[PDB]
């Protein structure tokens, strides 16, 4: 009562033919695009396939691909025994020959260190590989209990005296922690025809966008869209929003700003200018100050934007009245 076909297992003979067909494919794709077959590479292949078979499907897994068989197929679906039927690995009948073969090596290392007999922080800012990464190294499915047990054994190895061989071993299972630098990207300092220094930066609040041009030396003259700021912004709260960047760094009356804000309303345009001024003013302040701006909210774009209306309800969140029952 089974019609669903067996999950396909790939013989080494099958993958071997898939690699000869791919190798002949590269020579043909190279001949089509007029490139040299010897130097034709995986990057050139992907670019050629995108030109010859343009697909605009959003998901990239569904687009045409001519990749090396090692990539498209799973890495190790090969037979685990020979013609006679004798498995190749002495731990085959465990069902996790690769997980237990690794736990066999690390347990033997631990025993030699304990029998044979400094700071253990040889590597810092590193993490243990996640289960998904481990499963990729072993090429076999692991459970959470199997991963948890593997880490405990690796930790015990670090606790004990470790020669350079052990340190290299544990290194394989340590992945450098991603380094996201939460530090503002300082803008360059250009020079005008007059020779005065000035920096420029963009800012976006709601639908408003601004392009400020702060000058290193000035008397505090801010011009928005070729107008003064008291005229352009008759509301105090809009002017206070322009005061926040300079007042915070005690730099009032020391710079000359030229703004160009298009889009949005009065408050959204002041907010867009505030960010544009804070980002341009970074080039003329110390790095310790740039961090004080970043930590006071002056350098982060505000992500709050109007939410779309939903069909079947009065608003983005407002619902139609629940008729009286």
């Amino acid at each position: 009562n089974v019609q669903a076909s067996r999950q396909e297992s790939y013989t080494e003979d099958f993958i071997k033919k898939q690699i000869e067909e791919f190798n002949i494919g590269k020579r043909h794709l190279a001949n089509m695009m007029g490139e040299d077959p010897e130097t034709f590479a995986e990057e050139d292949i992907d670019r050629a396939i995108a030109y010859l078979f343009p697909s605009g499907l959003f998901e990239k897994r569904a687009r045409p691909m001519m990749k090396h068989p090692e990539h498209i197929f799973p890495k190790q679906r090969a037979t685990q025994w020979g013609e006679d039927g004798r498995p190749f690995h002495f731990l085959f009948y465990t069902g996790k020959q690769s997980y237990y073969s690794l736990m066999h090596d690390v347990y033997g290392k631990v025993m030699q260190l304990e029998k044979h007999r400094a700071e253990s922080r040889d590597l810092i800012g590193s993490r243990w590989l996640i289960k998904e990464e481990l499963e990729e190294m072993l090429v076999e499915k692991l459970s959470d209990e199997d991963y948890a047990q593997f880490i405990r054994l690796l930790e015990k190895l670090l606790t004990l005296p470790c020669g350079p061989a052990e340190e290299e071993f544990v290194q394989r299972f340590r992945r450098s922690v991603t380094i996201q630098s939460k530090k503002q990207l300082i803008e360059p300092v250009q020079y005008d025809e007059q020779g005065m220094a000035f920096s420029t930066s963009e800012g976006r609040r709601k639908s408003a966008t601004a392009q400020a041009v702060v000058y290193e030396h000035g008397s505090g003259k801010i011009h928005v869209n070729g107008v003064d700021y008291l005229i352009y912004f008759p509301i105090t709260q809009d002017r206070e929003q322009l005061m926040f960047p300079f007042h915070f760094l005690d730099r009032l009356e020391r710079h000359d700003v030229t703004c160009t804000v298009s889009g949005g309303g009065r408050s959204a345009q002041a907010g867009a200018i505030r960010l544009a001024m804070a980002r341009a003013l970074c080039s003329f302040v110390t790095e310790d100050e740039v961090e004080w701006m970043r930590q006071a909210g002056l350098l982060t774009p505000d992500p709050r934007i109007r939410e779309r209306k939903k069909p079947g309800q009065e608003g983005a969140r407002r619902k139609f009245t629940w008729k009286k029952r």
Partner: protein, 140 residues
Amino acid sequence: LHVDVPKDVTRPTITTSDEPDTLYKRLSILVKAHDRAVLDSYEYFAVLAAKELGISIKVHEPPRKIERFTLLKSVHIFKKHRVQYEMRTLYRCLELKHLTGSTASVYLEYIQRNLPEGVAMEVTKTQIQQLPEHIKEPMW
């Protein structure tokens, strides 16, 4: 063909006339499609063809347009439950410059005949000519 090759392939007859030729200062080609990748391939084909014929070309991407409309999901009643549909239009503008009328016809024919399915073109020729002979001299 390895050994069997045409000897003297016949070529179409191109006869130079005595009429003066058109002079296009600009020639804007706005192609539209639902698929960006098709525009990238067509942009590559068109820019390569222009460069091979000596034409000066520049390319930019006008902002895309998305048209959305709402419909009633059920066949009967159940007003509050709707389904929404959209059509996305993407643009690639090929701005050519300093073209004679013979160069603009052969190029446009070649690229229009190879216009992929689902792609619409909007050529905008800009011709430049002298002033009318009457206007040149004021006559009362």
